[model samples]
Target chain A: NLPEHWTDMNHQLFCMVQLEPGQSEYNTIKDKFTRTCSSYAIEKIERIQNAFLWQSYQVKKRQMDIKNDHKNNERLLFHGTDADSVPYVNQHGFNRSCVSYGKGTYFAVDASYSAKDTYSKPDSNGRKHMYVVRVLTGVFTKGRAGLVTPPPKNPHNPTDLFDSVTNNTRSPKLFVVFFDNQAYPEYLITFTA
Target chain B: NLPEHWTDMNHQLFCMVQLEPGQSEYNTIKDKFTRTCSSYAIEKIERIQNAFLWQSYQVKKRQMDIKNDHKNNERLLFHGTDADSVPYVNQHGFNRSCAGKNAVSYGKGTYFAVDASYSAKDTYSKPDSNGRKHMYVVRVLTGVFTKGRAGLVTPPPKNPHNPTDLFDSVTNNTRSPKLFVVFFDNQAYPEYLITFTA
Candidate 1:
């Protein structure tokens, strides 16, 4: 909202998944996704983040082949293995490995944070708790909203906020984006307490 | 609107990016963002997608950390690498390998066509451009879509006049679509991504 792009850049991306009572994504976000306006949470975000760390992508039995197993939501939406193969790329042994670290996979968060003077407790900006996320490399500049709607019905009244607005493009914006890595929300719920 | 329970399966999570004309992202969809007159041009949409694949995630060494890297008028809104490290998690030696095949690296700009230079080929890395150097995450691919209906087996033939081409799939299963894959390229730009209404 302000020219304080740094504040926004260093700010957190907030994922408020609001399930209509019995939505499916509710399970994944059950612990953390639970909130009622004034109070928010991150206890569950930790559990899921740990899961993304442990699983996803696999190494080929040999160098000639690279088969991946992105079974969970961690799989790259359109970038996952071919219909038959488990891979980070659809081609041959280009990847040479099962899982390439840091390379954009699903839920790859931009672990970058800001100095306290910029966003410590006082800089909370009305937000109770903000959990920095695993944004893909250049998610702001490259990843299209289409690839990140949850991860689409953007255009007019879109829900796809996967753009520069949330990026740290030298502005140090005051806006914060908070989201959990991997765990896709069938929906998000935001509350004002 | 009312609650929708599409059965016992999974639902979807969505994000909404906000932008203005002056911003770079604005150029991504300058035309479509022009106005909503029910009839929207897929042209602006194409630009945005292309921008998404071309410009994104960069650092000094620029080896390609592989964190999503989607930035544009329309983006996933959430997904980027931490300023400190490359990781979904620091578990095992997992995700430590550097740049892989078809995987675009730090400075490699997005490519195009089924077998273009390292700058073009998208996710498919087709024609066997496996080890091609430069890389980009938002690979572009080509496919054809015909207005579709539920359970519609085959795609209705294309009309020479290009009539009845675009159809919405939300209402009454308002439409059905059949798709034919042209090819995949890690370098594919948004312009290469197209849809046919008829």
Candidate 2:
């Protein structure tokens, strides 16, 4: 008998539960993805459950909300990664060291943008993977090219920093969260162009 | 008065205890660093207490050792990183996803060298402003290991006979492993942060 929340394919250290087609959980993911990213065919969807990462994320989220007077914002964002990096993300969560817009893990508001070749580099088998992550895009400031971290709320007070950084403050297309626990990978979508 | 194991400089979400110069904990880390990596003078040694990562590592170590009859080989290893990445490591521990400082020659995972001098070099631990560099003495749980190859996302299986049973970690050499690569983040803890100048 297999362990709880695991299938034969989920024999590794981390747990990946394949969603059955026609099930509610599966249909929900399929609809959200197909509605925008229609060019890619959804081959498989696996629900990732890394207790270590999940619990750590929850603890940090709770601490941030409490410390910042409950200004935490949550959304479903997309992160594109290479095939080899998929297992790494599944096990260790996202790395904040991989920065671009700001010094943090970058996420896309639109799945199609992350599905681009620049981010989701294909494997030798011509397959790509993406994660539909839960991001806490809290009080954010406009992001610049060389920003190591989110700018402070007041220049005089360096410790009083914004929660995150984004492309546009009014309508953000990309979100950069410094804390690794501020985001959690809810679903993995294996697709092909 | 501050919380337990906290000083004013340790007021972040994570705990950092500044070890007094003559204290046993402080002297232990100092001796170890000076033994091999003597070129650099240590600025400070802060004991890191990231409860979340530490607890997760303990759980994983217990699970693995128990499942395979207690082959939990724990060791104090060195991981060198840049100044910018120090705070992140203090808060979230080491990230296997960002192998920025080390090569995955042994395996496509987090690398830790037995020799502190190897990590103290500018290659792995880049120098920061004022010629400061940060290195960590990490507690690694290398349960059962084998020689690894390139492009390995996870540890390879033990052998053909045990396809389902996977190796816990990977190393540069089976007999004398100077470099250890652990695949999971929960397999290691950034136990101490040693800020030094090279």
Candidate 3:
């Protein structure tokens, strides 16, 4: 049997159909359990709400940091399996990190290159950009089926990528891309005449 | 002759003695200039006051950044000239430089360092811990004639070695023991450390 706190209206509705005749005790217990269940539901809802609020606050604070730092030509990037990936340089050897020009941009790539043996070279572009990358196997989703599953965002555009990559039950895989300025090298590097 | 705007009441008082005995134009010009000068003085005072207020606001806003970052274990240490001269570890090796725990800390140092070379370093200690090395150098009141100034207060009392040394002279060339920590390592090193005193 599930814990009293786990029993909700949906679970109760399912159990009511299986109830036996002349089971007075079951009805009485359900009456008491339903109130307890509602209280637990409210508590869980509040917990989720608070967590969301805190996460939003953290995101805003980080955005502000990026904005302020970018004003002076500084940027930060995260890459990895989730929102917190280690920062890395771009193909042009620029910090492919977040662009903090104003509102600050957060980006990430969903790729897992071999950290041990793979000597990944930046593209032949002499651009100044930075990026953070990560490794993952399967993409995650939300809703009833995804409650216990772990779906990491692309760090750059996890939500958008989620919509694009996760179709027909295909497992999520890694991809490479710049966090900002696809043509950044053209503007960043200068060859002296 | 100085420009009309540059002339103040002091100039008027000095010029009064040189005025011709019956020159009515001199009197009229003086009266007009005096009224204009008064208005300029008031405006100048208000402008200066407003500039100071705006400056204070900017300073406060930057300070908020420091406070928020510090709360997240990102405290920065800004060493003045006095602390820079003291022996300490840097990206290359043991040298007197400003140091801080992270880049944010370095920013704090840049905002508050008394000298140019004075760098910033990150501190692992809290704001109130005595041994905490990361503390902000808000103000430094130096004695003009004296060699060194007083009133050195380290936020965390435990870490007494973290001192922001200041020179007694106004010239920027004078070097004191001011210390700072750099955010990114300039050389191929893992961590840098420094030591100093009041």
Candidate 4:
């Protein structure tokens, strides 16, 4: 069980408020989910209201904006996890994943990509969970295997590295961010595939 | 075993070059370890030469510099780990730890101790056969930290004037913090590995 706050504000901030089917945000996310993979039946959508996570994301977003001359390149991305990890992700936020292309947390642009059994594995009840996160993919570079960090913007000028990394540079589909706060798990989507 | 590079340059960058006994860097780390805890005997010290990890650390250090008006607050710190985790840390980097103080209060983040002995405990430097243990001396960016609390997920706002402008890290005490907790993964770099017997 996750830790609970006895106070009112903390309870409100900690609570995961469920969204009704007709709500705009709910519909928008559902539409995106169906458009990507029509087979999976939608269950429910909940907005994560963790204040600390929101603040962390805002600070990173501001920093990225400052770095990129205020472009505000925040995108809706997806990350799949098991039901057991939902509480931990809700409480402390996502951890840096095991060494992938760049050794950072992986977030996919396509819901279908993240919906694979490799990522969105089904539980004992045949239910799956995935997060629709807000990622500040400021200035990403092409990622390769065994890369611990994003490569520098210019090899000659090694001081500035890319904000994030991607599988493709020309038409990127997935993003990897090194900073934990760079992406906020904004919404949780439960489904049955 | 970790991945290897065929090229010489990549090999050099990825190698964990061992520090000679008489070397200045080795002596420095040895002195620090001895000063903190004389009970243990250090067998060897290796300087981590992972280029990607270094680059990641550099980027974070530069960001911290930009945030703190170009004043780099990087400090030499220590983290204890089990023997099996050494290779993973060597290849990728230190993951956010869930430990004693980090488990409850001081917000959820990776814990790095200011003193070596603080990290040399059995709880951290888990003993193996013959009381063998491992520890890492890291370069930590402790940019403007404030006191943390239970359930505080991240650092709080520095001033009420601008709540968006938050503290970089969190700690037990602002004046003299024993544990510097950082939310960002690249905020700290594992610079050297020290194998010893406790």
TM-score of each: 0.20, 0.62, 0.18, 0.54
Using alpha carbons, what is the TM-score of model 1? 0.20
> Over the stretch B89-178, how does candidate 1's per-residue lDDT look in tens digits?
111111212212223221111112221222222333222223222211122221233333333212233553542221111111214211
Q: What lDDT score is found at residue B109 in candidate 3? A: 17
Interface root-mean-square deviation, each candidate:
16.6, 6.3, 18.7, 10.0
Error of 2 at B70 (Å): 2.1
Ordering by DockQ: 2, 4, 1, 3
Encode model 4's per-residue lDDT on B1-198: one tens digit a residue.
222422245334466777889978799999998888898999889888766566556766765676588565798999998876687678667655433454446876778888889889888889987778889999998888888876665567788675446688888887888888777666788889998985
What value does DockQ give for candidate 3?
Answer: 0.02
Query: Which candidate leads the pack in TM-score?
Result: 2
lDDT for every model?
0.23, 0.78, 0.23, 0.77
TM-scores for chain B, listed for all candidates: 0.18, 0.89, 0.16, 0.87
True contacts kept of each: 0.04, 0.00, 0.00, 0.13
lDDT of 4 by residue, A1-193 (tens): 1224212344344668688899777889898888898989888988787765665566567656756777767989999988877876876577664245766789998899989988888999998999999998888888887775678789775546788898888988899887677788888999997
Candidate 2 pairs with clashing backbones:
none
Q: CAPRI verdict on model 2?
A: incorrect
Q: Rank the candidates by lDDT, best first.
A: 2, 4, 3, 1
Which stretch of 10 consecutive residues in model 1 chain B shows the poorest summed lDDT?
Answer: B85-94
- Tens digit per residue, CA lDDT, model 3, A1-193: 2223322545221121223323563344333323322222111010011121122223323332343333222222222121111111211122222211111122222212211112222324421112222212122233122211123244452222221122223442222222222111111111110
**Compared with the true structure, what per-residue lDDT tens digits does model 3 show for residues B77-127?**
233222232222111121112323232321211123333223322332122
